[PDB]
Amino acid sequence: GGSLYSFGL
């Protein structure tokens, strides 16, 4: 996913 950046917390 990576909503925030890459991790997608």
Curated annotation (Swiss-Prot):
Modified residues (Leucine amide): 9
Transmembrane segments: none
Source species, domain of life: Eukaryota
Name of the protein: Allatostatin-8
Organism this protein belongs to: Diploptera punctata
